Nucleic acid binder design. Sequence first.
RNA 1: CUCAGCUUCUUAGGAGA
RNA 2: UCUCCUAAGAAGCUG
Lengths: 60, 73, 915, 131
Amino acid sequence: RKLEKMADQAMTQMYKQARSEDKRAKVTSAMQTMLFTMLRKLDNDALNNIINNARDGCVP
Amino acid sequence: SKMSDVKCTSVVLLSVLQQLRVESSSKLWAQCVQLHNDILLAKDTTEAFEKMVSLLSVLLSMQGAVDINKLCE
Amino acid sequence: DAQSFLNRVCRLTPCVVYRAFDIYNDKVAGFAKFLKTNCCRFQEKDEDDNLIDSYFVVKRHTFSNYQHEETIYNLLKDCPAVAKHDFFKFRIDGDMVPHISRQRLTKYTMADLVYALRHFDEGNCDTLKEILVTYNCCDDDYFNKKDWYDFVENPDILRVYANLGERVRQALLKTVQFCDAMRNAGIVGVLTLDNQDLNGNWYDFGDFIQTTPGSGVPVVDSYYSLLMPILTLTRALTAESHVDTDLTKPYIKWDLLKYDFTEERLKLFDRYFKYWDQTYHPNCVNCLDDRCILHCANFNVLFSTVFPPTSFGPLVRKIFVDGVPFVVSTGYHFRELGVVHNQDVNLHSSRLSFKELLVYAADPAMHAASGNLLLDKRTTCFSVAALTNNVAFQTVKPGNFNKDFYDFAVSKGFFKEGSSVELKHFFFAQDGNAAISDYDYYRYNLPTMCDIRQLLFVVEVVDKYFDCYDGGCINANQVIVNNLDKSAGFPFNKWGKARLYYDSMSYEDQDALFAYTKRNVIPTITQMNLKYAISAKNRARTVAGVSICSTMTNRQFHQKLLKSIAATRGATVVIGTSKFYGGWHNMLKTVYSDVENPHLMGWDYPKCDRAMPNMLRIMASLVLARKHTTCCSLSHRFYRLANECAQVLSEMVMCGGSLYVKPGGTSSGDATTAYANSVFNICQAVTANVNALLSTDGNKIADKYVRNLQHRLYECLYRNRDVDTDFVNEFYAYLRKHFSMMILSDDAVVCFNSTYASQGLVASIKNFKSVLYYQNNVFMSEAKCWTETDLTKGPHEFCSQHTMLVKQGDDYVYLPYPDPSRILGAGCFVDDIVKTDGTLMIERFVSLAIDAYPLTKHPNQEYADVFHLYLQYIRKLHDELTGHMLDMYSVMLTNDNTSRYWEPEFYEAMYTPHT
Amino acid sequence: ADQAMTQMYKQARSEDKRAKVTSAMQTMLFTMLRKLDNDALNNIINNARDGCVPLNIIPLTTAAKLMVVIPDYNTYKNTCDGTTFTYASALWEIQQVVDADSKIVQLSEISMDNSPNLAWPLIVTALRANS
RNA sequence: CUCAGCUUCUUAGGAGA
RNA sequence: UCUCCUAAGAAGCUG
Ligand SMILES: *Cc1cc(O)n2ncc(C(=O)OC)c2n1
Ligand SMILES: [Mn+2]
Ligand SMILES: [Zn+2]
Ligand SMILES: [Zn+2]
């Protein structure tokens, strides 16, 4: 039973480090995706108009 | 309404701007920080949305920095 | 009798008010406002029919006092500091009655000004406005501005007050002349502020008695002591900075190499305080005890404003080691402590050991001497040098958004329209010129002279609050360091953490360093760092990283007492007491302490760390050091005080790669910051009580016990020199009985007898406002404070916690609950990206649920829902973690003991007294 | 036996780190003293009555370089207008100006019209004139 | 990237019943 | 199996 606990702790540490590295690597793309998802949800007229203008090429 | 949504989106937007190395411009970073802090303290949704548009204009001005077309499909 | 009388008094216009008096007799004592006796006041009009500040005051007197005053005036007649008197007799009812006409007095006296500036109320400042307008300090239209009196919102008021300084200085000079006349004529009497007008003339000789001509004896204790705060508030001694003491002449150009101003200080003392009979030591290294240190440091604070700012700080000398020259600090010139010289200065050293090398690395002398000259125009603080070719602009990043928790909360009905629970705590971002802006808030620290006779009694009463603790020095092996992975300060932070230096230095080395600091002053550099925390205010907060040498020696000096304070339950200082397992209830029941008509009040200091005057910080340090009566000598304790001042009071600050001079204030980041704050808070409370009791009319106190308490309190302050232990004990018992405090750093709760407060026998919020105004240079707003008349509601706020009385089993207990917005903001926003992955951070949500549990007892369901939201999110996170573990590995987590983390019981057990 | 070996290893590590930090501090202290101006420092030290001088005057009277941080154009015109200025009873000649971004700024660019286009504060580095 | 206090969780070790 | 005490690591809150 003790060996099971040791293996469980080792696997928890491995999972923790894997998740930490993966989270810390994707930071920029994840942040941009989140930003534009939230902007889509907002559905304000001015934000949508500005974003569509930038998409078409009319940037400030 | 949408007050908390606007505030959270402004937080995420300033995080994205910082990730794009906007602190390398003292003027631009100061303006963005001012707008972000103003949005967080806002009590009127219209004023917060105006400042949100102003803050997103900065992000969209640097067209080459972030790929608008890819991000929204 | 309205036509001939006026002529005999004579260009005078024919003619209930309360004035401040300083009374002491066998019936009453105090400094309070009384009704003015009947007198005829004829206002003198200028030739242009313009009324001026000249009055003729004619009063009827008995024959005995008439003759007595006439004799004394004839003795004192030829002094120019004495107002002109006219003695005559006037026919009334067929017989002559004596009248005395004090000629050309001003409308107000010095007592009026002192009372107005010390018992300040923003709603009842008519006398202060009249004084300010009459003497051209400002115009009526200056008071239409909001917060014209606030030192922070309206820092221009300092100039308006400074416009009175010359008047005050002239009054002091005339006082000295008057004392000389009294000594030469052989007259004995007590000088009181109410007998001197605002031109500096003295006009009341009733209590004076004659004596051998050369052996007169003026008494000036209460006069000078009550006047002292106004001297610094109005900047009276500014004229001493000019040539020939003329305000229209250029400033004196002192030699830059000059640092010893002992003779200048003695000249100033002999010029303005000639008949102050207690001995004055310009250099406090010659003082006899800590009471003498406070006494002489007060005068040093007053006098140091006259000398160039470049003369204060480390005194450096060139020494040789291995034949190469070093510039090292061999002394220090303190604004309050004068000149101090190190006793163990060694020239031509053979080689540097680890201890000497550490000391020389900590010294700011080499860093400043090797750096460039700096002229920083962003701040008004004295700038020493730039240690790098570039300026650093450190910013603050925004927080990270935990979108999963936000979505979960919104799906549960949170953040709707009109709900009482809204997001108010965020991570505010800052731009490049933020840290220096925060440092600039030290401009609120001003030289504040204290009422020394009042402070020397308040210090004894405050020391009464620290009699149950034990203290003294300990060896390097007995020291407890909580975290050794903290910064070691500058320049030590570039080679390792505190662990490196605690490991490199053996116990013998640390003991040697401590013994070295008991004979020498080591000035160190403090580093200002920006805090990255969640807050409801846009302000950025900076923390002070002290050097490792200062931290090490201060720990070895104070840790015994600090641990003793933190381990004691039931005392007024509640540092170290947990709020769990019934600790909150215990603390509240302790502070209630069977007060008779209990009301609760509370306050928190504005600009606490940036505005604390240096005198009160020195007083707190001396109170803490009073525990070394056996382990330390007088000089050991003095040098420990000097090191403390040089390291955490007026040391050099590293901010953005540059060295600045810190004017004063507590350095939040040193060993004893919280306990020193507690001492300062208790001192302010005791001062408020003293001013409340002595400013009350004694004839209207219906309790004989409290009237004799007032009389004896005045005696002990302004008439008795030696400490009266019995009365200190009695006053401490009185305060404990009627004014029960619970103190944690700059946070306080008070349970007080409301009847006494209404009668003026104990302090109230207005007394605290007055004391803060005249002793801390801050205006305290009534929105900062709070008052609760119902004890079942508990204190409104303490340490950011609200209180509720809830049934817990069979009895009602007080529980603390936080702002729901604070907990929700902690959940939604994090300072690290990896904290946004919930499955990795379940324990932090468990802790947040522990903090939020008492909200379930709230009568508002929106508040109660936060704890259930956190429990549901914990359940969801555990489910997701198990799913991910199964997907990533063909295993089962098998942990069935986590089910307790989404059930109320685990958290309910955290507030039950069993443990 | 294992515990004793671990303790010996820890003591060896501590001694090695102690030697490292000792060398680092010695190097810093000996590097810092090769930067100061020997002539001016010796002059002021000799002028001193008893050797002790306040530290705050060492940079004022002996530093060969001055850095001025200007927050706005008004302060610029007040303090360091032109290519030379007077401060601390000495004459300083401007050697370089940079903005908050650490970018060189020509003295012709510092004008009322162009002030809004500059990244304040400006940092001006000048050298003590007259040798 | 400071001082101090309190609290939760995990691990290694010692003692007692 | 339970309790206490030493150390290490993670985290939360407060002034
Ligand atoms: C009413 C009254 C009586 C006496 O004797 N007085 N002496 C001085 C003053 C006064 O207020 O002058 C400043 C005064 N008033
Ligand atoms: Mn009188
Ligand atoms: Zn003394
Ligand atoms: Zn001691």
